[PDB]
Amino acid sequence: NQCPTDWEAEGDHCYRFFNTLTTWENAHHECVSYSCSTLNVRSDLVSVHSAAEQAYVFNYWRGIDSQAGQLWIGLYDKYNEGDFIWTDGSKVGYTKWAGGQPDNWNNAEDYGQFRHTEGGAWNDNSAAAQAKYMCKLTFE
Amino acid sequence: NQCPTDWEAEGDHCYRFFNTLTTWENAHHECVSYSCSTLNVRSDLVSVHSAAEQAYVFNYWRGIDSQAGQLWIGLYDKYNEGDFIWTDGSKVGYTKWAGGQPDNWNNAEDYGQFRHTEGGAWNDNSAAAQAKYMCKLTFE
Numbered sequence: 586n587q588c589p590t591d592w593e594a595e596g597d598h599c600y601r602f603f604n605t606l607t608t609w610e611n612a613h614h615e616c617v618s619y620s621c622s623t624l625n626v627r628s629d630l631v632s633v634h635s636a637a638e639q640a641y642v643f644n645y646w647r648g649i650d651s652q653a654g655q656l657w658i659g660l661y662d663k664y665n666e667g668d669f670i671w672t673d674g675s676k677v678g679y680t681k682w683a684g685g686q687p688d689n690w691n692n693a694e695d696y697g698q699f700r701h702t703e704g705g706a707w708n709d710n711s712a713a714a715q716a717k718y719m720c721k722l723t724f725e
Numbered sequence: 726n727q728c729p730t731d732w733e734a735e736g737d738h739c740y741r742f743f744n745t746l747t748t749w750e751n752a753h754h755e756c757v758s759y760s761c762s763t764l765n766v767r768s769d770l771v772s773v774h775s776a777a778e779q780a781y782v783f784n785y786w787r788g789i790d791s792q793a794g795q796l797w798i799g800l801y802d803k804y805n806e807g808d809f810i811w812t813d814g815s816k817v818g819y820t821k822w823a824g825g826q827p828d829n830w831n832n833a834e835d836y837g838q839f840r841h842t843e844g845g846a847w848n849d850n851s852a853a854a855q856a857k858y859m860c861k862l863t864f865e
């Protein structure tokens with residue numbers, strides 16, 4: 586494959602899991618920092634556009650990490666409450682919200698993440714929460 | 726594949742043909758300019774390590790370009806006359822010099838290039854000469 590070292594190939598993308606508990610905001614900033622303008626490579630929190638991509642991302646994550654917990658993804662509704670969008674600017678199609686989610690619990694949940702159960706069913710969580718994270722390269 | 730837009734994939738690498746006449750020196754700089762330090766991607770003039778890579782590069786070039794002329798590659802003997810090496814630090818195994826080449830013509834030819842004939846058989850040319858050029862990404 587043609588992925589940078591320490592990134593994994595799948596389809597037209599590269600992915601990299603970071604086994605560090607941090608905030609969504611910091612995970613987002615970390616992923617974006619790998620970007621490279623000279624090749625128009627965007628690095629960003631992972632966006633998910635199919636069941637296949639969901640399964641790949643989840644299976645990659647849980648192949649390395651077996652702790653109970655969550656995995657930040659690039660979905661958020663910070664700018665317009667209830668309207669979830671991807672940080673990489675790609676259009677939302679596929680969704681996999683867990684039962685009862687999203688719920689904007691305590692009016693402070695704007696940041697998307699996989700649960701470790703139900704094949705990575707999604708939850709919205711707060712700016713104070715911690716989770717692991719996953720970056721994705723997009724060749725723009 | 727996982728190559729950047731406007732680059733082509735083959736094996737563990739990406740390649741990109743630039744259909745513009747320029748000097749070897751400028752071609753070298755142009756190719757290195759596509760490097761991405763955050764992803765440990767080194768871009769350089771193409772190095773050629775087998776008959777397969779030779780044919781891939783030649784056929785890629787000649788898929789686009791109909792003109793008689795040459796294609797700069799990363800081979801040079803600028804720093805040690807008569808010992809051609811790759812700018813990307815990979816070792817010279819495979820060679821495909823044209824008959825009568827290299828000849829260090831007028832004591833001034835230190836830069837490698839494919840001819841548009843004989844499957845891209847190589848010639849050494851001067852710092853004043855012009856050719857098209859091909860870059861290559863190496864994921865270090």
Ligand SMILES: CC(=O)N[C@@H]1[C@@H](O)[C@@H](O)[C@@H](CO)O[C@@H]1O
Pocket residue numbers: 795828830834840848849850851
């Ligand atoms: C393009 C090409 O192969 N050019 C060469 C050149 O480098 C020099 O070797 C010369 C010797 O008469 O013959 C050819 O012109």
Ligand SMILES: CC(=O)N[C@@H]1[C@@H](O)[C@@H](O)[C@@H](CO)O[C@H]1O
Pocket residue numbers: 655688690694700708709710
């Ligand atoms: C990790 C996770 O899913 N946490 C949620 C949380 O965001 C909140 O929605 C809550 C509402 O009771 O329930 C949980 O299941």
Ligand SMILES: [Ca+2]
Pocket residue numbers: 662663666692693694695
């Ligand atoms: Ca909000």
Ligand SMILES: [Ca+2]
Pocket residue numbers: 662663666667689693694695696709
């Ligand atoms: Ca919200």
Ligand SMILES: [Ca+2]
Pocket residue numbers: 686687688689690694708709710
């Ligand atoms: Ca929630």
Ligand SMILES: [Ca+2]
Pocket residue numbers: 802803806832833834835
């Ligand atoms: Ca010389």
Ligand SMILES: [Ca+2]
Pocket residue numbers: 802803806807829833834835836849
């Ligand atoms: Ca020479």
Ligand SMILES: [Ca+2]
Pocket residue numbers: 826827828829830834848849850
């Ligand atoms: Ca020559």
